[PDB]
Amino acid sequence: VRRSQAWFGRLDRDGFIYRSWMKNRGIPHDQFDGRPVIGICNTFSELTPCNSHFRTLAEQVKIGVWESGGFPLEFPVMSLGETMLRPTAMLFRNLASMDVEESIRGNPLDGVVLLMGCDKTTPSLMMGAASCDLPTIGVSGGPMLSGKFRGRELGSGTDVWKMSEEVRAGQMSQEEFFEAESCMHRSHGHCMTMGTASTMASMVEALGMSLPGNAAIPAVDARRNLLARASGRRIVQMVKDDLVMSKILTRQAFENAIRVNAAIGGSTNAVIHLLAIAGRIGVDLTLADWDALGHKLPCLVDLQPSGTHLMEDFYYAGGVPAVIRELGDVIARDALTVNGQTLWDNCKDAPNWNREVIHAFNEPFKTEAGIAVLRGNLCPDGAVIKPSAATPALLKHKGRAVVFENSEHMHERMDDENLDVDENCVLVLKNCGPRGYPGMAEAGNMPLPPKILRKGITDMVRVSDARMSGTAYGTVVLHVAPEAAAGGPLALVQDGDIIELDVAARKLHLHVSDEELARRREAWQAPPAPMARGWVKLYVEHVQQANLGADLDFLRGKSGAGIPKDNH
């Protein structure tokens, strides 16, 4: 027996209640006979343009379930369109996780199918489902087609920062920049660079939570429907075999995902998200793990932002299975995946059709290009930097600090010609973390002063307690914890202070005495409440720091999928 039979299999007065209303639209009674009921978490939304094709994806999963003798039922949760949600989509990631967890536990579901696409929709669904630990399979929406503009190609996000900086440098017209928005995005799917959505989709696959190939298949490609449908077939058998998430999301699975993230030039936001997911399913995973596991690992994928190619090219080259094939000596081969096979059984024979996109391990795209975690007096709980999309000569750098108290203080001063700034200066941004912004917005890749861009300089060192887009680039220190709004030493950085950056030495030092800092702390008053009410008030007072996953403290962990009380 399984939990859905505690609803539909009842011969009580409640059994009438649990079935009669469901039969109002024409459901045959044998669908309640005890066959696996499959809940399909559908994040479709016309406010989430990257998941706007998920109704077509949902009917595809339902088919596979109907084929394997299951009972498919889709349900909605709060969807998270990254380009639309302000202050930031991350502010509502934890709220969506409660939609997922409660909708799964409260309903007669034996298995779960997760429809994930834009960035924040992947962790929110993974976090919520992990707190229930039912047999779960993830289906990604797929990346968009490559943008086609004036005979060349455009990259999601990566070319937004690039073309924007060129407009402010006087190197690109402002009219041309705005004509490219109908051409950069011409298809269904998520951001088609190696941004958060592409990496999280790769993380879902590398964790074993999806069928092989789930990450790279374009949304408008027919193979995306096949995989969504094959996932509908598989989840029915997963219920019969009781292949729960905890049997897949193990310590080794997370170790493989971090190794793959380094090889694919993955986004820095995967660090926060996988720590949040591990905190729900129960796997021990710290921020120090990310530096130790990705240690000395190379980047094998020549894709934007770290490279030049796009997700469409990454798919035709072999996708994630071809990347896991290169990692055969560092991966945990025996890690189990949701299709019944190991991660190595599904990738040992993966073909590679383009070595200019997916390199061989021993002659890779970039060496030692995994995400690095920095330690120092400036970031006690840690900080991250993505050297694959960085410039080499800046990974070891020290210079004068130019300080911005927040985003409004920054946008004002960055465009100031009277700003005393150089090319070897350190731009510092504060109060943009979980409590500060609030929601830890993607403002880490802050634009450079216009007079610096006019000299051909496109990158300089930058430290902040904020995130940045997975599509962003530059030597940017991110997730400085504790954030300035929580009383972190970052809040005390002042103009003229000396910042020491040493990614090789894992060092981020603030050259001012502890005595000087200590008296600077006498002035620091905590920022006021952003809102005295609502979800944001709950978020700020309960959100954890970025080094733990930015989850709410009372949501950490799991409560299983036991059968609750009846409703009457």
Query: Which residues line the annotated binding site for [2Fe-2S] cluster?
Result: 21, 50, 118-119, 191
Cβ 106 to a second copy shortest distance, Å: 4
Task: Establish if 78 lies at the interface with a second copy (CB under 8 A).
Answer: yes
Alpha-carbon distance of 125 to 298, in angstroms, equals 30
> Is residue 408 within 8 Å of 398, Cβ to Cβ?
no
Sheet holding 111-116, edge to edge: 71-76, 37-42, 111-116, 136-140
> What residue 197 binds from a second copy, Mg ion, ligand FES, none (CB within 5 to 8 A, per partner kind)?
ligand FES
Number of residues that bind ligand FES (CB under 6 A): 11
Member of 64, 195, 307, 321 binding ligand FES (CB under 6 A): 195
Task: Establish if 119 lies at the interface with Mg ion (CB under 5 A).
Answer: yes
Cβ 428 to a second copy shortest distance, Å: 18
> What residue 288 binds from Mg ion, a second copy, ligand FES, none (CB within 5 to 8 A, per partner kind)?
none
Q: What are the counts of helices (DSSP H) followed by strands (DSSP E) for the chain?
A: 20, 14
Nearer residue to Mg ion within complex by CB, 132 or 197:
197
- The H-or-E segment that residue 383 falls in is strand 382-385
SS3 37: strand
DSSP string, 467-512: B--TT--SSEEEEEES-GGGT-GGGG--TT-EEEEETTTTEEEE-S
Name the binding residues for Mn(2+).
82, 119-120, 442
Task: Establish if 337 lies at the interface with Mg ion (CB under 5 A).
Answer: no
* Other beta carbons within 10 Å of 200: 33
Task: Establish if 380 lies at the interface with a second copy (CB under 8 A).
Answer: no
- DSSP category for residue 154: E
Provide the token pair at 357.
Answer: 């996109």
The four Cα atoms 126, 287, 198, 302 give a dihedral, to 10 degrees, of -160
What residues contact 216, with CB distance under 8 A and at least 6 apart? 142, 143, 198, 201, 202, 311, 314, 315, 319, 320
> What residue 28 binds from ligand FES, a second copy, Mg ion, none (CB within 5 to 8 A, per partner kind)?
a second copy
Task: Please give the residues from 447 up to 506 whose contact with ligand FES meets the rule CB under 6 A.
Answer: none
- The H-or-E segment that residue 121 falls in is helix 121-130
3-state helix, strand, coil in the chain (%, to 5): 35, 15, 50
Task: Establish if 190 lies at the interface with ligand FES (CB under 6 A).
Answer: yes
Cβ 125 to a second copy shortest distance, Å: 13
Single out the segment in contact with ligand FES by CB under 6 A; choices: 188-196, 272-280, 299-307, 403-411: 188-196
Cβ 397 to ligand FES shortest distance, Å: 29
Task: Establish if 144 lies at the interface with a second copy (CB under 8 A).
Answer: yes
Cβ 233 to a second copy shortest distance, Å: 9
Task: Establish if 131 lies at the interface with a second copy (CB under 8 A).
Answer: yes
Sign, Cα dihedral of 493, 431, 290, 363: negative
What residues contact 495, with CB distance under 8 A and at least 6 apart? 400, 401, 402, 403
> Is residue 293 within 8 Å of 255, Cβ to Cβ?
yes
Task: Establish if 157 lies at the interface with Mg ion (CB under 5 A).
Answer: no
Member of 73, 112, 115, 118 binding ligand FES (CB under 6 A): 118
Task: Establish if 7 lies at the interface with a second copy (CB under 8 A).
Answer: yes
Name residue 404's beta-bridge partners: 429
Provide the angle, in degrees to the nearest 10, between the axes of the packed helices 251-263 and 269-281: 170
Nearer residue to ligand FES within complex by CB, 312 or 326:
312
Task: Please give the residues from 25 up to 54 whose contact with ligand FES meets the rule CB under 6 A.
Answer: 50
| Residue 555 identity | L
Task: Please give the residues from 95 up to 124 whose contact with a second copy meets the rule CB under 8 A.
Answer: 95-96, 98-99, 101-103, 106-108
Nearer residue to a second copy within complex by CB, 252 or 308:
308
Task: Establish if 196 lies at the interface with Mg ion (CB under 5 A).
Answer: yes
Nearer residue to a second copy within complex by CB, 79 or 202:
79
The four Cα atoms 103, 109, 113, 114 give a dihedral, to 10 degrees, of 10
> What residue 96 binds from a second copy, ligand FES, Mg ion, none (CB within 5 to 8 A, per partner kind)?
a second copy
Task: Please give the residues from 136 up to 165 whose contact with ligand FES meets the rule CB under 6 A.
Answer: 156
Mask of contacts with a second copy, 29-68, x by CB under 8 A?
x---------x--xxxxxxxxx-xx------x--x--xx-
Residues that bind ligand FES (CB under 6 A): 21, 50, 82-83, 118-119, 156, 190-191, 195, 197
Residues that bind Mg ion (CB under 5 A): 82, 119, 196
